[PDB]
Amino acid sequence: SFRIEYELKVPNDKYYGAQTVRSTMNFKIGGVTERMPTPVIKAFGILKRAAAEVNQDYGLDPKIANAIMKAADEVAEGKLNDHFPLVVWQTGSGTQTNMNVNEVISNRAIEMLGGELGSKIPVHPNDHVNKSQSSNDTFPTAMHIAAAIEVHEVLLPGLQKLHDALDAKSKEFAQIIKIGRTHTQDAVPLTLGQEFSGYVQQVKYAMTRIKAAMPRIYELAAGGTAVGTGLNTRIGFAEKVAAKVAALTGLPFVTAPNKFEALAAHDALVELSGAMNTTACSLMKIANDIRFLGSGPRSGLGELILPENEPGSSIMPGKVNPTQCEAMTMVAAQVMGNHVAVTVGGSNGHFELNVFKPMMIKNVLHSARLLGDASVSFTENCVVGIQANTERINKLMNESLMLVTALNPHIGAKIAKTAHKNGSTLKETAIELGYLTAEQFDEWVKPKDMLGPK
Amino acid sequence: SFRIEYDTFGELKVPNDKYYGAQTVRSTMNFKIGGVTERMPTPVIKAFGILKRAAAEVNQDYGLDPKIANAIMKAADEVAEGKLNDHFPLVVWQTGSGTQTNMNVNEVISNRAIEMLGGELGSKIPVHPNDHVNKSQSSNDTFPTAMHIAAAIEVHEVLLPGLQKLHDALDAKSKEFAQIIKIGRTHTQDAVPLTLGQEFSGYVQQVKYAMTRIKAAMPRIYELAAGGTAVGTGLNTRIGFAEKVAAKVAALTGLPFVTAPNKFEALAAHDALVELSGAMNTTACSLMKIANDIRFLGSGPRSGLGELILPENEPGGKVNPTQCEAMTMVAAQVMGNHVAVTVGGSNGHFELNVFKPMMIKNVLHSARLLGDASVSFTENCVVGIQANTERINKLMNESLMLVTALNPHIGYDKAAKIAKTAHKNGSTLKETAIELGYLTAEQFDEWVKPKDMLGP
Amino acid sequence: SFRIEYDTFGELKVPNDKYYGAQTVRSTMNFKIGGVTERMPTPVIKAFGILKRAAAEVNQDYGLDPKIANAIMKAADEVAEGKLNDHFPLVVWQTGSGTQTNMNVNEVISNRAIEMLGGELGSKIPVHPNDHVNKSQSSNDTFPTAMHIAAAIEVHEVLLPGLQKLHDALDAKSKEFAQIIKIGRTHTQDAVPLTLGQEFSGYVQQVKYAMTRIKAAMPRIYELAAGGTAVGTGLNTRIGFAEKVAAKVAALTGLPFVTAPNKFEALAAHDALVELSGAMNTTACSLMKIANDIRFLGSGPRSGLGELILPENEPGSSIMPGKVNPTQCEAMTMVAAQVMGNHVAVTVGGSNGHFELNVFKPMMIKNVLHSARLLGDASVSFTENCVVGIQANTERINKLMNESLMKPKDMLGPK
Amino acid sequence: FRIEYDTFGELKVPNDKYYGAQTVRSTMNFKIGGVTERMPTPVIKAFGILKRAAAEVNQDYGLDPKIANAIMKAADEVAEGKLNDHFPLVVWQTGSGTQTNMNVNEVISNRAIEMLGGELGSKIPVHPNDHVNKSQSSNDTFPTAMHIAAAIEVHEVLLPGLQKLHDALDAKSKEFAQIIKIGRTHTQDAVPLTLGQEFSGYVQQVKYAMTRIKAAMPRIYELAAGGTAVGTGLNTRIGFAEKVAAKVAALTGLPFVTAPNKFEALAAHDALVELSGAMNTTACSLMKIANDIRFLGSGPRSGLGELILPENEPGMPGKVNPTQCEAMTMVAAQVMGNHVAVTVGGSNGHFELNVFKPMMIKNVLHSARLLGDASVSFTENCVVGIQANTERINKLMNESLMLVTALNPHIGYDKAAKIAKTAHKNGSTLKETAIELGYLTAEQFDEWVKPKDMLGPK
């Protein structure tokens, strides 16, 4: 079932039009997995909604405006995602997605007003849906709205859950004393609470970093039009559209103070990617630490008992693996690659317009989503159920050579050397040698007194 | 609308219209990372259907009942053929060995094979997901096997044929523009002449060499881990199984799959994937250059360079080099993907690298993007490019680079005087030569011949 | 002429004209990786001078004899002031805690302080490298402290002043060019008008935003690990040492250093360096764009765009009349590509901490300092040898207006 | 000081230096990054080789043999590292490296003039451009020097370092061939493999690194010389390109050839990206090897403790830091960032000339030399002295609950899993549990559960 638009066949069941069909014919790169990410499309919904309402100030008939507003909300609410077939690998201004949005909002609005789909009557994609706007200033506007929403709704709440779970564990483990490891080698004592407090600070700081990388994300290009001058838009449009987006989202969007910078570069997305990159480094460390600390159960480090969620092996009967650590550390690796892709696009602006926009936002949204979702999965399915193997930890304290120093201000090396050579404990050796009693060793050597400055 | 199934952790509801089982349901519950766009790539799923098909045939030499084997071979074929893709809901961001996808595959094939035999789905009867579908295998050696199969098919069916179109199209264009002389540019400044054909021949060479680089990075992709089992020893597999399955995979694909000579290296690392991603990274550099040049050479129509007229396939009356944009975006993405692969590859622990899903996702992503982009750039840009000869001819006549042609005919000092004079006055060399009185228009035309400025 | 010192593996000749000792010599043998270009960065050595100077003055509170502390303070100052650079032969590619450089520092300062007090070089008397120079310290908390001191100082003295000069020169040119109307380019295609001042204002905003980004990426660089000792607990150090040492370093430098609130996080990761590198990475993206634009806009003399006349910085060629190569554009864009690579190196090291200690420390600071210095110096060089000398070809800019297919004075803002 | 001149004013040139006015102006105009950023000596030496080859060939094209002879001698001195102090320029110069080409022409001119008994700074009788640069461009000489430098560094530094490490790892693999250890997958206790088998994996990775690097070398052997300004070879003599490549081939003993397409050779440095690609793979391999050895040597008592690594530091008693593992893993991380640098430069060619050349070759050489030296140092100071803790290895392996895998073909997966879970709940042996469970006799367990039988297929 098709309709003719114009000279192109458009499926009768689709709201897009000829310019979207036109764009599908020539950009068949990577197929449907490569379709423009949903948050971009939704963000466009919010944009076209904002612009339509504001445009009533500049001669937009309220009947048309209201229908566009309603159609856009449907877009923004993810109700019309099947009407967006274009890939990331399209024109690098993202204009083809802008046209897609205009066409879909036009035809849904037209339907709503009882017109014929494809007619451009009474809602015209360019004259009404794109009123006061351009390709060059719309896609970057959507990018930033989409990035900020993803950070506030997915990324930061994920991190917060992780931070809170780690902090709870740190408190739970505050009196559990284990052997430090530096260079992977046995080192002086600290609590599991202390070590976990390190992970907490890193996630606290990851969140601080991401927040720090947001102010320029809230700057919107809308109003720059073709080259940043604002040619062919109305005075005040730029500001009023930013403000409507802010009020619709509850986020502090403002018009970009320099539209040339806003269109010719996407340095804010590179900045935000940079924050996610630091965050990936932090999470790699935390998840890899917990992976190793949970290793065994018998012939690894064995300090942590990680929740068992599924079987690990068809051959090795009863094996269970730290599979949440793995998804998280894989996501961390992906984010680091995503960042280089964003950097290469960001660096490759030409004169008035950076035309790597779709790829940059694809990578930013992918990193943000992966990090947010992994942080929740890792929290709910690993961190919250972590228990300490205190038997193992306690045995490893009593079997370590790192406590020998406690005896220095009592008896004055040979214990440690002999214990090391004989394979025995510090206590066993001290007694075998006859330098102290079993009661004495217990008096002198108190690991709870080895956990701070004196 | 659900049936009840079981694994060793216990009982789970599975939707009646799905061939997967309890461990797949379990994975969906525990790995909610990224959503549907993050599903295990289809090439890995199809590759698994190839492998399981191969395993099931060979396993008849090791006891597997023919009735069971046949059914398994037919199910696995439907997986390989892309008939069962909706029965694979699991994401890339799962266990780092890809075990959960292995189990997805075992379950989907087990159930389709049971249905073909009129058994009850989810019963493990008569085709058990582990004891039959996964006979003589481990997640540890099967997921690497599927990766390399997937990788090789994508290179052979998508990447290389894409690059071949592009090579051939650039080379035809090189030939077509062999007689068109333009001003070379070095540091972006006017240099000395070369033909448009010569310039395009550099691109042809770059693409030829990209293909050679990809092919050079393939030998260790053909090495399959299958047979290493849990840690690379082959524990619980019969001798000969490694080699028989690798050969069956070769015969099923027409590609030179062989058994990895060191199964520890094959499980503990995915250096071959890093190598291949490396070749694609070079290819992305070559393509960035070609497509950026073509973009700039087509710039204008009036205040750019304006040497090439690129096909107008859509509206910008404005129209933009939109295929060059797609392609240079793809190229940038490949470079990022390459770092993701390298970080994953760098991070093996002891007997198993557990970054496998992420590594093959990026390699496959890069291969499909480069291949598809190459076809699109060829068909929708390269083949239609025309030279704006009226513009190129006008720029030749207005360049100051040709004045050295006058040296032997009038001396260096008069030749230098002309360039300096035309430079200050904004005039042609010829105008200034004639105005200064050093020569006639007829002498200037006989003396300054850019076609004699094209070789040693 | 040499002296003989010993370490746990043997006697060693130490040249009598050097203030380092046995441990340094042994490190030169055991880490023969890369050569003289790979030497630990001078800013790290200098930052060690400041740190050991602070620790020595502070350690008087915790029993360090004043005559020993004063010699150590003096000798440390000479290290900090760059008077002893030749006594640090060690490469970046050493232990990942940078222990050997801490030992280098301790040895050098010991032997210079010994000499000031009139003792025998190589003797550990009366100034002992571990017991006095390293007093209250660990290699694990000293190298991170020196890294952050080095990075902040390089950010303040080199990177930010470099970018400031560039911002100011671009802005000057934006103003100078504010009334020159040119053709905009989008997708490289001819577009609607903008001024050259307008286009240049984009570049000015980018550099302003770069400095903003870099300053935003500093707060956690000011946190110092000193006091965390071996694993973060501060075991075997004295209560109040962490704070006193950070406060002394803050007074010594005039930068706002503080003790890291969480020492485990301070030792186990260098996420602040990754953050700072990320800001330089964005800056590199900005500069790549500015420098490449200026490159293309200056193209010609007749087959390019020809909007800008760039100052000549090379001899002319007779074979190519009028060719003027954008030399600083090339210097800057190479530097930009370099910072992007360096950032990946920092990221990989950052990601690879183990338990109580990240042992990728030397390479992470080397990359950070490399990027900072290249960006600062390239920003000053690009300013003084390109930007300030830029002229517009108003004849050609304009002629390509009455030639464009796109009153232009009435097309530069909204209606 | 002597006085010399360029188009921008008078320049003092130190009497004790062989460089000239263009070099001096370059030190003034490219003050980026300081001394560590000086152009790599391998590049300088490689230019020595090229200018030696060019001088000898140019005797076919009008070069006075007296002059040529003196240029050859001076060029040999550069190539032998006798004149390193006369190259003050940084990597961060023009993107074609023209200032280094100028530096080399000035130095060779002046040292040649001094050999002929003329005046330093005079361009008489050896002109830096008319003689030392005869038949050459700035645009084809720097790429030629890049590839000569890269090829030499691969053959003299990188491949021999890797070879040594390969041989040391293979020796250790043989030494450990009968030590049965526990495999770890996902870091979890697994089934046995020998320590020799685990080390055989490292051995294969280094073998393959060397194969990868050699596979990435063919297009590095391609030389741009003769391409001149844009690839066309305008203003050079026919046969110069072929003759200089052959002379470079002959001087070095490496299979250098002329680039079959000079446009590709000048407009891109894809071969450097390719070579860097091979080093990046190599870095992943070394990261894994060095990280494993690090972790395997962890202890003395709260780590894995399977390996005893050599002491490289003063003595926390018993603590032996894996210092070489640390140097090697830092180096591996650096090669990965360097690869990005090379990639960004290589991606950014314009029209007839890629102007990222100095940066690209600096990163390639930096990666080759760090990998080569680190591999030697890792071999000599770690790998050759590695010992096994056989007592600890044995106990760690015997304790693995996943030895129960042995019982699969005898009693089935489900009953092996119950043995394992209940051994893990109770803290019992596998044997104590299976006897108590009624699943096997003590004797059937001993005959079914034998680690020395789990090392290969049935």
The H or E element containing residue A179 is strand A177-182
- Collapse the DSSP code of C124 into the 3-class scheme (helix H, G, I; strand E, B; otherwise coil) and give the result: coil
d(CA D204, CA B261): 9
The H or E element containing residue A436 is none
3-state helix, strand, coil in chain C (%, to 5): 60, 10, 35
Domain architecture of chain B: domains with CATH: 3-137 (1.10.275.10), 138-401 (1.20.200.10), 402-453 (1.10.40.30)
Residue type, A45: G
CA D114 centroid distance within chain: 38
Q: Is the dihedral of CA C351, C355, C361, C363 positive or negative?
A: negative
d(CA D372, CA D368): 6
Of D178, C41, C316, A426, the residue nearest B189 (C-alpha)? C316
Q: Helices marked H in B269-388 — which ranges?
A: 271-297, 322-345, 356-380
Beta strand pairing call for D387-388 and D307-308: antiparallel
Can you list the positions of beta strands (E) in C135-242? 181-186, 189-195, 223-224
DSSP assignment letter at D94 = -
d(CA A132, CA A232): 7
- Annotated catalytic residue: which of A313, A350, A410, A420? A313
B338 contacts on D by Cβ (under 8 Å):
343
CA A360 centroid distance within chain: 14
Of C392, C385, C148, the residue nearest C272 (C-alpha)? C148
Of D339, A194, A10, A63, the residue nearest C338 (C-alpha)? D339
Q: Helices marked H in A173-266 — which ranges?
A: 192-212, 237-249, 259-264
d(CA C383, CA D291): 45
Q: How far is C412 from chain D (nearest CA, A)?
A: 32
Cα–Cα–Cα angle for B206, B207, B212, rounded to 5 degrees: 95
CB C382 within 8 A of CB C328: yes
Q: Helices marked H in D179-239 — which ranges?
A: 195-215
Q: How far is B81 from chain D (nearest CA, A)?
A: 32
Query: Which own/partner contact pairs does D453-456 have at CB distance under 8 Å and 24+ positions apart?
Result: D453/D406, D454/B233, D454/B235, D454/D191, D454/D192, D454/D403, D454/D405, D454/D406, D455/B233, D455/D180, D455/D192, D455/D193, D455/D194, D455/D197, D456/B233, D456/B234, D456/B235, D456/B239
Q: Give the residues across from D181 on adjacent strands.
A: D193
Put simply, the chain A residues between 333 and 372 with a CB less than 8 A from any chain C CB are 336, 339-340, 343-344, 346-355
Q: Do B231 and D261 touch (CB under 8 A)?
A: no
Query: Which own/partner contact pairs does A440-444 have at CB distance under 8 Å and 24+ positions apart?
Result: A440/A410, A441/A407, A444/A406, A444/A407, A444/A410
Nearest to D301 among A186, A299, A318 (CB): A186
Interchain contact A421–D (C-beta under 8 A): no
Of A98, A104, A85, A90, the residue nearest A130 (C-alpha)? A98
Can you list the positions of beta strands (E) in B144-271? 181-186, 189-195, 223-224, 258-259
Q: Give the residues across from C354 on adjacent strands.
A: C357
Q: Which residue has the tokens 């499980």?
A: B267
CB A289 within 8 A of CB A332: no
**A319 has binding-site annotation:** yes
CB B111 within 8 A of CB B5: no
**C186 has binding-site annotation:** yes
d(CA A34, CA B361): 13
CB A187 within 8 A of CB A402: yes
**Method used for this model?**
X-ray
Q: Is the dihedral of CA D116, D121, D127, D132 positive or negative?
A: positive
Q: Give the residues across from B224 on adjacent strands.
A: B259
* Chain B contact partners (≥3 CB pairs within 8 A): A, C, D
Query: Which own/partner contact pairs does B154-158 have at CB distance under 8 Å and 24+ positions apart?
Result: B154/B43, B154/B364, B154/B367, B154/B368, B154/B371, B155/B214, B155/B218, B155/B221, B155/B276, B155/B367, B156/B255, B158/B367, B158/B368, B158/B371, B158/B372
CB B89 within 8 A of CB B103: no
Of B226, B153, B193, the residue nearest B453 (C-alpha)? B193
CA-based nearest residue in chain C for residue B293: C188
* Chain A contact partners (≥3 CB pairs within 8 A): B, C, D
d(CA D125, CA D133): 14
- Collapse the DSSP code of D194 into the 3-class scheme (helix H, G, I; strand E, B; otherwise coil) and give the result: strand
Provide the 10 A C-beta neighbour count for residue C65. Answer: 13
CB pairs under 8 A between B and C: 112
Nearest to C183 among B303, B305, B412 (CB): B303
**How far, CA to CA in Å, does B140 sit from each of A316, B134, B279?**
11, 12, 26
Of B3, B347, B90, the residue nearest D284 (C-alpha)? B347
d(CA C70, CA D80): 49
Interchain contact D269–C (C-beta under 8 A): no
Q: Do D333 and C349 touch (CB under 8 A)?
A: yes
d(CA A356, CA B426): 37
d(CA C152, CA C148): 6
d(CA C185, CA D42): 43
d(CA C356, CA D423): 33
Beta strand pairing call for C181-186 and C189-195: antiparallel
Q: Which two tokens stand for residue A268?
A: 């804010």
Of C32, C99, C7, the residue nearest D381 (C-alpha)? C32
Q: Give the residues across from A87 on adjacent strands.
A: A35
Beta strand pairing call for D2-6 and D9-13: antiparallel
D185 contacts on A by Cβ (under 8 Å):
321
CB A145 within 8 A of CB A253: yes
CA C195 centroid distance within chain: 36
Q: Do C334 and D363 touch (CB under 8 A)?
A: no
- Active-site residue, A375 included: no
Q: Which two tokens stand for residue C38?
A: 């790979």
C346 contacts on D by Cβ (under 8 Å):
337
- Collapse the DSSP code of B418 into the 3-class scheme (helix H, G, I; strand E, B; otherwise coil) and give the result: helix
Q: Is the dihedral of CA A398, A402, A408, A412 positive or negative?
A: positive
CA D268 centroid distance within chain: 21
Q: Which two tokens stand for residue A276?
A: 């996610």
DSSP assignment letter at B130 = I
Q: Do D420 and A292 touch (CB under 8 A)?
A: no
Q: Is the dihedral of CA A193, A197, A199, A204 positive or negative?
A: positive
- Collapse the DSSP code of C393 into the 3-class scheme (helix H, G, I; strand E, B; otherwise coil) and give the result: coil
Binding residues of B for substrate: 97-99, 128-131, 138-140, 186, 318-320
CA A12 centroid distance within chain: 38
Q: Any idea how long chain B is?
A: 456
- Collapse the DSSP code of C392 into the 3-class scheme (helix H, G, I; strand E, B; otherwise coil) and give the result: strand
Q: Which residue has the tokens 């040895």?
A: C107
DSSP assignment letter at B207 = H
A315 contacts on B by Cβ (under 8 Å):
138, 229-230, 235-236
- Collapse the DSSP code of A223 into the 3-class scheme (helix H, G, I; strand E, B; otherwise coil) and give the result: coil
D405 contacts on A by Cβ (under 8 Å):
315-317
**D408 has binding-site annotation:** no
Nearest to D347 among B331, B345, B456 (CB): B331
C-alpha Rg value of chain A to the nearest Å: 30
Of B56, B81, B59, B51, the residue nearest B70 (C-alpha)? B56
d(CA D282, CA D278): 6
- Annotate D143-174 with three-state secondary structure: HHHHHHHHHHHHHHHHHHHHHHHHHHHHHHHH
